[PDB]
Amino acid sequence: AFSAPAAYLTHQQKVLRLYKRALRHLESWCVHRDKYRYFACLMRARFDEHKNEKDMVKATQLLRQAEEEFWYGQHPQPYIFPESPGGTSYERYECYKVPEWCLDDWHPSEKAMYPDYFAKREQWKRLRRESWEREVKQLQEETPPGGPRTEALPPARKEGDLPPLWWHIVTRPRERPM
């Protein structure tokens, strides 16, 4: 989720993803641990048989054919972690995620409470104002001509520099704000 995506998925990426999906769905099928371990090792062994195959056409024939088998026995109700995109608590706490700039709209009587927090916030705002002005030039000079080719950002290269476009990545609300 954090890393930028690639222009495509290689054959080894596809086989690894298929291995991951198949092993997760077999764990969903095999509730008990010993049965799952035995069948997972049997599946791993079966998987490793075609490991040294060099024919690309044959390589294409492998896995895609397996994918059809995976689709046939894909356990229509697989196990999903609670916070995963299919879990029962996927977006439970998105309603508690309040943006940071909202604090700029607080009444002064409210800002009277928590003064140290707002002082540190002012220091953060100063740092952002300087760093963004540096980052604009840094990204303008480092970006390839004709526009970027991959949505990955370069790190900071000087001493006082900060990572470009950092304000909204560092200032995430929290995973569980309340």
Add this chain to the structure above:
Amino acid sequence: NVLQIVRDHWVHILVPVGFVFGCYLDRRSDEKLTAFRNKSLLFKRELRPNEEVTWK
């Protein structure tokens, strides 16, 4: 301060003056529809010892 706040707050008096004027005009227009006063079949009534009109 009187004679100073008046020049700025004189406008407020207008709506109530319009209301009392409208009430007076309503009564005056009412005064012209008395042709059937104390003459309706449902309310023929004999006047009181010190009464001149049933309603004004």
Add this chain to the structure above:
Amino acid sequence: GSTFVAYLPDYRMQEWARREAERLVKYREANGLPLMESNCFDPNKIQLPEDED
């Protein structure tokens, strides 16, 4: 305004109608009359046109 609307006098005559109906039914039951009549107006004062067809 809500208080004024709540305590508006009975110009719709609902309690008046209830008392009128109460007195009327009290009288009708005693006389043995059959409650409310089918005809809204007395037929003796209605002059139908004779058909002769």
Add this chain to the structure above:
Amino acid sequence: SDAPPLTLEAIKDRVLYVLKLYDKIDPEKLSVNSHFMKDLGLDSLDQVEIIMAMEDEFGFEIPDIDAEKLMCPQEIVDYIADKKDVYE
């Protein structure tokens, strides 16, 4: 909830625990910064099985794109700390 506020020490301890119960690695040779491909001679399938164990240990599953480019216990701990917003 009543969940203790887990820290970096606890995360790293549990990571190394899971890795030492991985019998394909002898415990006395691994380290915090030890690589998976070269320092331990593990297959890519072994790495994704390590990812399986991590996901089943911490109760959350890592996306495949991030998982496939995790080769050290230290960077795995750093990633999971970033996900869980760990202070110290």
Add this chain to the structure above:
Amino acid sequence: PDSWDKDVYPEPPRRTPAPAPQTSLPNPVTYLTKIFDLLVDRPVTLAREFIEQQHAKNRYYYYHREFRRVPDITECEEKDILCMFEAEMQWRRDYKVDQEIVNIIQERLKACQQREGESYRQNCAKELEQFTQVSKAFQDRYSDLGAHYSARKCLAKQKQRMLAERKAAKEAAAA
């Protein structure tokens, strides 16, 4: 209570059985209702007495309005607007009175259905027939007039019904 007439809304004598304790165990209902009386009914009763003596210290009366009888729409000329106005007002008042009469009969029916409980199908035949009769009468007078109803429309409906009745009677006699 004297607030309402007993003949208009009749009620049975309301015979009630006597307590027959077949066991020596003290039932909770009697003690519970006694403590309820002591803690609730007495303070409410004294508050009511205070309010009643406060009311008696100031006394005033209001009188039910009485209306004269006015010639109806049948004693009105075809274009004479004053008598038609008076007749329309009288007809509307009579319509309101009939609505209240039907309301009273429906109240009687509902009270019977609740009071006689499980044997409501037999012990409320009198009220059912009473409501059937009054509903038949009321429906004949005003059912199809609709919105913008008037005394003239009601009179026309009555005339149509009575010509139909007269034709039916003549045909039956001459059958």
Add this chain to the structure above:
Amino acid sequence: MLKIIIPTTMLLPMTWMSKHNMIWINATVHSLLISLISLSLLNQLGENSLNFSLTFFSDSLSAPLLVLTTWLLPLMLMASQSHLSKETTTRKKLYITMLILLQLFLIMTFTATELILFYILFEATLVPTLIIITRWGNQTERLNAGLYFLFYTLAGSLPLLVALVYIQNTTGSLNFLIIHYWSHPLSNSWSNIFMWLACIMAFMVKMPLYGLHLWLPKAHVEAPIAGSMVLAAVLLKLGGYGMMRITTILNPLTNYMAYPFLMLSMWGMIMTSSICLRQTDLKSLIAYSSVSHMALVIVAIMIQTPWSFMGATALMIAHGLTSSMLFCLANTNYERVHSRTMILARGLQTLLPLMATWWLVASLTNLALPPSINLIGELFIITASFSWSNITIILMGMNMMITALYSLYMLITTQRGKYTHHINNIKPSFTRENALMALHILPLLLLTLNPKMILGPLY
């Protein structure tokens, strides 16, 4: 009746002689006082009417509409106070003058003992609305919307004047009282058919009827907040009032005549409620919901039974208040976002909780939740239609379901979910806006305690 009219006229010199920074304060206070004065008219009789004079009378159909018309002006002033801040004093005074003139025309329209006076004022209300729409409008299509609104109305109403003058030439009077007492049946003739059409289509266009409803989305979307409020709350009810007043002469021709309209409205409520489901605009969605409600009111008036009339009156009042509240909420969102599209600003409940509560209450009262007067009118009209025909309920059923859907849809798209990350100019809701919503919503929940006060003359 002049005790209400004269203060409304005096509102103009008071506004124009006001200090440059005291117009809003003076206008709101005196408008609220005039509204309080209007409350006296509510105490109606079961007898004929409140005939004040030869020119004006009151009725329990006219009294709730008059009270609502008077109450709407302070709300419109408070809503307009925001976006007219950077505006010269003369033009703000002109805006207030136009609002006052609109109120005066509506007040004289609703009493109107005579039909030609009613028509004159009914069409006099058109000019201030047109000027408000085409002058203080944001987009470039306000001119086209004003043209549509003017010409639909005039095309509908020009035959009405000819029909009225013909009716006076034949009968001899256009007075409401005389017409009611001297009503005579209309023979089923081609000339009578066209007279019926001329008498009905003018009020049908302003409801508006499903076939003729195009002007309304344009006029509502392009008008300012005060214009939208006055269009949705009062101006749509003029057609219903006119139909209820003029239908007496029409019988017995209405039964045969009513079928094209009954079918158009019963299918158009479904069509517009379904259109509401796929909309990218708040204002258009509210406009189509208004069209559906007024189609139901058309059905109620055309059935022409007592329960139909009571339901139509209650539904008109409830819809006026609810639609004004909905437009106010949409305008509060727009003044922050400047986009007026639902899908852009999302998750506003997290940022504005009290405003989200107001949204919930408005959507619930638009949904016709009992025992609100919205459902009172809904149920009375539905029962009358069922007595008219046992099949109508099916259509009505669909309508209810669809209504609820889009209502909650509008509640879910803008208030629930995740707030858009980029928008950062969402400031806390002002006291003025919260007061506006409270003053919109409290009368509904007060009126549900006394429904007979808005059930019309056939109660």
Add this chain to the structure above:
Amino acid sequence: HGKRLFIIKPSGFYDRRFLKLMRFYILLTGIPVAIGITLVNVFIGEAELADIPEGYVPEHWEYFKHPISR
């Protein structure tokens, strides 16, 4: 444990202020009205139906029961 973290939330000052103002004004007018209604009901109210004396005609406001209505 001293792990008290800061809770970022929108400013509720204005909503609370509006609610307090609305309650204050509504009560400011309703409490006197409620007190007056209670005093009228307890002390003066609840007239009881009578018969019109012969030769006397009542005034228009004497046909109502509640004193406030009269």
